[PDB]
Design a protein around this ligand. Structure first.
Ligand SMILES: Nc1nc2c(ncn2[C@@H]2O[C@@H]3COP(=O)(O)O[C@H]3[C@H]2O)c(=O)[nH]1
Ligand SMILES: CC(C)Cn1c(=O)n(C)c(=O)c2nc[nH]c21
Ligand code: NA
Ligand code: NA
Ligand code: NA
Ligand code: NA
Lengths: 328, 328
């Protein structure tokens, strides 16, 4: 492209373009570049325009969100960026601006950015079984997700970060409610429940029914959260090692502290391949299959990579197993 | 009775007998006497026996619970004592020991004691509208009740207060879950919902069905919580002035802060009579009417007092109105 060279935090035209697509390489970029991307999304989606978001607050706020993500192997700022960027992608892929109000898009995007704030890197089962302060604070009800959500609104309450400061109270209340529903909906304990409620509505789906649309937004955020395997293989694959890093940290600690261990986080019973095959076949494909009933373009862009990944992990397993047929 | 005088915190035989009935005068007693009452309940119901509760811990725990109630006009330690004492009365009145396990009795009683821990004296609507720390911590979801419950388990986690220290983890988990459900059930925003679910189960109630029993337990705690008017008039009436004292404190503060004022708390609009008539006819009677379907002894002991009070309060209003009219 360009006749001179610019700082990396000035995103190039090529990057801006690439950012609209689920093929975007989320590993290329350092945090301040990711922060620029998130900023751009808010401008590009018309959210700054339509909600009078002070552009410097938008930046202060993102910087502050960034500060409140922790350096976990998986549940970190980059993960949050994936989730937000996949939501961005979904807005274009599925022409969500035809279907949803700008308020709904604000909710989706802001929920996506905030959905894992201050995650400690051990899940709700650890919290509850260890009787941690969070588990006690929230009475064993989606403690992490309640916490993410609370931290979100603590941040937004600081005046210099309050991107909603020019939205009237009714709008604030509408956004707040939406975000709480959506962030809480990311608790995988509720996956089967949420999927069932959705499928029920899908029997006769209605874009002007608020309840249908809440459930769609819940499915949308859930899709984005667990979307890593939708991405190109070279981009998706590193995330699995991060996931297991975090799972193994937790399951080791559980063993050490006499707490119950989950077999799907058990160092002894788990490889990349076995982790991903079940998850792809039984969580991701089905979810995206139903989304596709509403948005057919999803099949080609997102079900296909999932099929390809499923098949590759199946191959890899064949060879992992062989490899342990030496040994043991 | 007795051949010598004993300290007030040694309950007399006559007190021990009277404690078992809903006629007990909750106003006669000082905190330490009320604590000795709660203590006796745990021994008398076999809970000290069946859960190996260390008797000194039972006392530390009750003292600590007492310290974490605030000195509000209504939501104070004495109210907590009423709710617990009414649950104790209900256990005998309804022969609940025939229907419920001791684990369930433990849940009902401990929930009853803890259900309003650290109440600030302003309701959930105030917390949500004023956007308080509790509202933000709990994302607008039954913040008070979540808080009471968190404080309950904060107390029980202090080893010197852990009356559950000799229960195995499976028991603990079972008790904790129950207590959370029951304390959360006390939020009156959920009244109509909970009542409807119960009425559904009542169409063919089944004491062996865990969901039926959760709902029953929920109803029982809700009964005891709002049970003031079930008591003898001279014991019931002073509580109305306390309730209004708290309500008026809230609406005054809302008026001052520019927040919305609920008419039922507006000192310009409310009287003892108007407060209680609607509440009796339309929340209390119906609730106890359905409990009577399972426990017909409840009619004579609790509906009758509620009818008497209703009629008394309608009559007070008829008089109030005759004054109002007589001036203007
Ligand atoms: N096996 C597997 N699990 C995943 C993947 N992505 C997300 N998850 C799981 O789904 C969960 C969604 O919510 P969390 O962020 O709590 O934690 C996530 C992981 O436990 C993946 O690629 N593979
Ligand atoms: C509107 C009503 C729920 C308010 N309310 C209440 O919650 N409790 C517990 C009472 O005793 C009561 N008495 C009058 N109004 C009351
Ligand atoms: Na999450
Ligand atoms: Na997540
Ligand atoms: Na309460
Ligand atoms: Na109460």
């Amino acid at each position: 492209g360009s006749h001179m060279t610019y700082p990396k935090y000035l995103l190039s035209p090529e990057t801006i373009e690439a950012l609209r697509k689920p093929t975007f390489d989320v590993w290329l970029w350092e945090p301040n570049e990711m922060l620029s991307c998130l900023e751009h999304m808010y401008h590009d989606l018309g959210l700054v325009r339509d909600f009078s978001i002070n552009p410097v607050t938008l930046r202060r706020w993102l910087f502050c969100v960034h500060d409140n993500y922790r350096n976990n192997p998986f549940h970190n700022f980059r993960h949050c960026f994936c989730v937000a960027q996949m939501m961005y992608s979904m807005v274009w892929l599925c022409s969500l601006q035809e279907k949803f109000s700008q308020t709904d898009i604000l909710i989706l995007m802001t929920a996506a950015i905030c959905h894992d704030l201050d995650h400690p890197g051990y899940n709700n089962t650890y919290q509850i079984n260890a009787r941690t302060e969070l588990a006690v604070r929230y009475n064993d009800i989606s403690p992490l997700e309640n916490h993410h959500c609370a931290v979100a609104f603590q941040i937004l309450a600081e005046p210099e970060c309050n991107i909603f400061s020019n939205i009237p109270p009714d709008g604030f209340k509408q956004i707040r409610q939406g975000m709480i529903t959506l962030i809480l909906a990311t608790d995988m304990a509720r996956h089967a429940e949420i999927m069932d409620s959705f499928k029920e509505k899908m029997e006769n789906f209605d874009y002007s029914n608020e309840e249908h649309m809440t459930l769609l937004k819940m499915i949308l955020i859930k899709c984005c959260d667990i979307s890593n395997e939708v991405r190109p293989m070279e981009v998706a694959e590193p995330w699995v090692d991060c996931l297991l890093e975090e799972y193994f940290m937790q399951s080791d600690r559980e063993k050490s502290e006499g707490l119950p261990v989950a077999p799907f986080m058990d160092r002894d019973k788990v490889t990349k391949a076995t982790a991903q095959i079940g998850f792809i076949k039984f969580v991701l494909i089905p979810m995206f299959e139903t989304v596709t009933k509403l948005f057919p373009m999803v099949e080609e862009i997102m079900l296909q990579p999932l099929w390809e990944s499923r098949d590759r992990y199946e191959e890899l397993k064949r060879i992992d197993d062989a490899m342990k047929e030496l040994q043991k």
